[PDB]
Every structure is written in C-alpha cells, then in structure tokens.
Design a protein around this nucleic acid. Sequence first.
DNA 1: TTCCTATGACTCATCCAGTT
DNA 2: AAACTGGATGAGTCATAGGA
Lengths: 57, 57
Amino acid sequence: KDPAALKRARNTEAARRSRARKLQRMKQLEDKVEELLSKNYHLENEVARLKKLVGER
Amino acid sequence: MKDPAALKRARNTEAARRSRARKLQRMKQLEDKVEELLSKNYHLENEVARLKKLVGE
DNA sequence: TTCCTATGACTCATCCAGTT
DNA sequence: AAACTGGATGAGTCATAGGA
C-alpha cells in the first residue's frame, strides 16, 4: 500500500457512502411529493363536503 | 499512436453528461412540486377552517 | 457473434472540516 | 493551515446490462 493506494481504496468508499446517501435523498423527495398529493386529495374533498352544507362560491 | 478508443470514450462521456442532466432535472422537477403542492394545501386548510366556522366541526 | 447506449462503480483533482 | 489528516464532491473513464 502506497499512501496513494491507501487513499484510493478509501476515497472509493467515500464515493460509495455518497451514492447510497444520494439514492435516499431522492426516495424521500418522492415521498414528500406523494403525501402532499394524498393530503390535497382529502383536503379538496373535505372542502367539497362542508361546502355543500352552506353555498357555492 | 492514436484514437480507436478515443471515439468510445468521447461518446461514453457524452452519455454520462446526458444521464446526469436527467437525474438533475427529475430532482428539480419534484422539488418545485413539493413547493407548489404545499402551497395549494395551506389555502385549502384555511378554506376548511372558514367553512367549519360558517357552519361547524 | 457485434455493436451501442444508459447506469453502476472507481479514479482524479479539489476542496472543506475537524482538530490541536 | 492556502496546509496536518482524511472525509467528501463533480466529472471523466471503466465495467456491465439491456437492446437491437
């Protein structure tokens, strides 16, 4: 192992934990986009229900 | 002396430029929708507070 | 066989952070 | 210390999977 050799198999792992970590950062941004659409589904229905027992505007 | 292989890299290297613009744009694309959706749903939460005050809970 | 791209993995040159 | 020690980012290149 030169310090370049040591260094390379170690950088190679820090490039790794980051692809793994970059995978998670988008799988979550998919979920915050999911739940927000389930919340807009239930919320505009809720409005149409209380809307009905009063007026249309 | 030359480029057999310098054509295979200058093309693979375009392809990695390309594959990486896609991931860049699905990521900014979803994040705008997290801001957008967020915004619709506060307005709707307010309209629901209001119609449950016009009428009730 | 043979060719060709799209994506994972590894290397390189930076650059940044903690730490004393 | 804008230079120790070692991790971490961006972009080219390598190894492979899939496609035709």
